Amino acid sequence: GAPATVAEQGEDITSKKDRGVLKIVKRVGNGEETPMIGDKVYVHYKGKLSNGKKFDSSHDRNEPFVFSLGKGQVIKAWDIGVATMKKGEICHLLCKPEYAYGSAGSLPKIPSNATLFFEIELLDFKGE
Contacts of 96 (CB under 8 A, 6+ apart): 18, 19, 20, 21, 77, 115
Catalytic site residue from 42, 65, 99, 101:
101
Architecture of domain 1-128 in CATH?
Roll (3.10)
Resolution in units of Å:
1.8
- Residue 81: count other Cβ atoms within 10 Å of its Cβ: 26
Burial class (CB in 10 A: 0-12, 13-18, 19+), 113: middle
Helix (H) or strand (E) holding 6: helix 2-9
Instruction: State the distance between the two ends of the chain, measured CA to CA, in whole angstroms.
Output: 37
Report the candidate in 17, 14, 27, 15 with the shortest Cα–Cα distance to residue 92. Answer: 27
CB 91 within 8 A of CB 24: yes
Catalytic residue flag (residue 101): yes
